[PDB]
Amino acid sequence: VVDPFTRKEWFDIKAPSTFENRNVGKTLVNKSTGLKSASDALKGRVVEVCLADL
RNA sequence: AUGAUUAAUAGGGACGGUCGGGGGCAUCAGUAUUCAAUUGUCAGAGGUGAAAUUCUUGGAUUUAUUGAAGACUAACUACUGCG
């Protein structure tokens, strides 16, 4: 009764300059609300990507 | 002729370069195991020849991040080694 998919943004993942393809992909985060931010729910994530893609 | 038999493909001991998973463990680890904290998601997850006992909005199972305890040291591993 909530449909939680149409309340999220999309953020573009960026790789360091040591690699050449610096666009990895996109991810979803919830909205920022009262004493609940989107950044602190985002600052811990680890992305696994093949080095052949970078 | 002044006086000691060889130097055992017997044994012991010295020496030389090695060899080995041989003999307490100090930690250095380990894509894993029930557990703990946080995160996303929505209905089942186990388990079996079929099932049931069990756990499931207190969100199970799955997913991510970070931890803490826990034979051996998987694969390498063999008609191979050491005692």
Experimental determination technique: cryo-EM
- Give the 3-state secondary structure of residue A21: coil
Contact A6, A40 (CB under 8 A): no
Is the CB of A1 within 7 Å of strand B?
Answer: no
Q: A3 in the Ramachandran plot: left (φ > 0), alpha (ψ -120 to 50) or beta?
A: left
A5 touches strand B (CB under 7 A): yes
A41 alpha carbon, distance to own chain's centre: 10
Q: Which of residues 27-46 of A touch strand B (CB under 7 A)?
A: 30, 41, 44-46
What tokens were used for A3?
């449909």
The SS3 assignment for A4 reads helix
Protein-proximal nucleotides of chain B (any atom < 7 Å from a CB)? 39-42, 64-66
d(CA A2, CA A35): 21
Query: Vertex A53, ends A51 and A54: CA angle to 5°?
Result: 65
Q: What secondary structure letter does DSSP report for A18? A: T
